[PDB]
Design a protein around this ligand. Structure first.
Ligand SMILES: CCCCCCCC/C=C/CCCCCCCC(=O)O
Ligand SMILES: CCCCCCCC/C=C/CCCCCCCC(=O)O
Ligand SMILES: [Cl-]
Ligand SMILES: [Mg+2]
Ligand SMILES: [Mg+2]
Lengths: 212, 210
């Protein structure tokens, strides 16, 4: 990499070390500079080696508009109930329906962006700090050879060492668990979640080889 | 964290971390500079106190046991299965070469047994082996901050410069972390009187399962 690209990476990395979790603007900035088109094409090609991956780039399945209230009426063992409950408790607002996902790079980012909270629920990762690290290790296992989630792991390890080292064991226990769970699970990329709202979460996890 | 990391400490820690990111592995100078600003005396005091909770830890700060001079050639005359031979062999193959205050003993004991921890834990010398060993250290030296920050810098270096190692690097981290929590404390061991112990028996005694 050029010295210029390197300084933009390190500057974004420093902003993430110094700011709270969930700094999506700086994560996006780090992403732009860290995952270049060559990296993104290799991720697209790897994900495309499975039939579910290949089809998802062809069909570009999107979530669509989500009715949190209606999902919250489902039986409380379903994916739909659990997802809605996760959104209420964490004060999260569902993703805005997006339309420009033509290029594979744009579908990759839009699909992963809008299903982030669903992957939280399906992998069983809490939204506390060790749970975010756990989910990032899970992403790292599934999106090889991506660079972003590896760097997000690094940023959270440094943040732990500098500001809150009492969390060390819980943070590395989470990273360790999400890495192993990520290697063992089936690919989550490309799944059409809005057809699974009434599926019981535990059976969905079992069929995905997720053992929470 | 109840103690402060001041603005000034944060600035010095980040500058030291950036130099480690831009330098190759094995920069023991720059690692010492990160250590000095990151493991400040409050942290070193807690590490000493935590390590002194065991009898071997307490004794090690009293007696301050040091390796002393070591004759690699003589150690390399021992049976193949021994710690002494295995260590000497490790030094020869990689062409490596080998205090009254608690914080000074702490740093000098860990610095001089670093190669021995490599041998005893079974960590290779390549980059994934260093990360494995670093994870082993952060399991054993809670509430230290240096080794966690060293994991962070090697994950960032992998993301930026050598992403194809990602799998090996996180497999190494994961194995070292688990092995480190499961093993008995390695700190404070007088290795100079274990050279003739078969390495595999010493590992069993220490609950090290490679
Ligand atoms: C494989 C290439 C990936 C490029 C697209 C990445 C965009 C995916 C969007 C989901 C990112 C969610 C990560 C947010 C973590 C917040 C916790 C933290 O601050 O560490
Ligand atoms: C608990 C307080 C620790 C204070 C002692 C600090 C020094 C410890 C001994 C040095 C360990 C060397 C580990 C460095 C591995 C080199 C690979 C790399 O560059 O990442
Ligand atoms: Cl939650
Ligand atoms: Mg979420
Ligand atoms: Mg999250």
């Amino acid at each position: 990499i050029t010295q210029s690209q390197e300084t933009a990476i390190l500057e974004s990395f420093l902003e993430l070390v110094k700011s709270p979790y969930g700094n999506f603007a700086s994560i996006g900035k780090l992403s732009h500079v860290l995952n270049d088109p060559d990296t993104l094409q290799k991720v697209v090609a790897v994900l495309s080696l499975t039939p579910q991956g290949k089809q998802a780039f062809e069909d570009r399945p999107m979530l669509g508009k989500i009715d949190l209230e209606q999902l919250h009426q489902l039986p409380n063992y379903t994916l739909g109930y659990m997802y809605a409950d996760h959104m209420i408790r964490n004060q999260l607002t569902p993703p805005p329906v997006n339309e420009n996902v033509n290029h594979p790079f744009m579908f990759l980012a839009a699909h992963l962006g809008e299903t982030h909270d669903i992957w939280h629920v399906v992998t069983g990762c809490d939204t506390d700090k060790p749970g975010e690290v756990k989910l990032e290790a899970f992403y790292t296992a599934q999106l090889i050879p991506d660079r972003l989630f590896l760097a997000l792991l690094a940023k959270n390890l440094l943040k732990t060492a500098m500001y809150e080292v009492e969390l060390c064991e819980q943070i590395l226990d989470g990273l360790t668990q999400g890495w192993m769970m990520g290697k063992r699970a089936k690919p989550l990329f490309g799944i059409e979640w809005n057809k699974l709202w009434e599926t019981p979460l535990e059976e969905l996890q079992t069929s995905l080889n997720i053992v929470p």
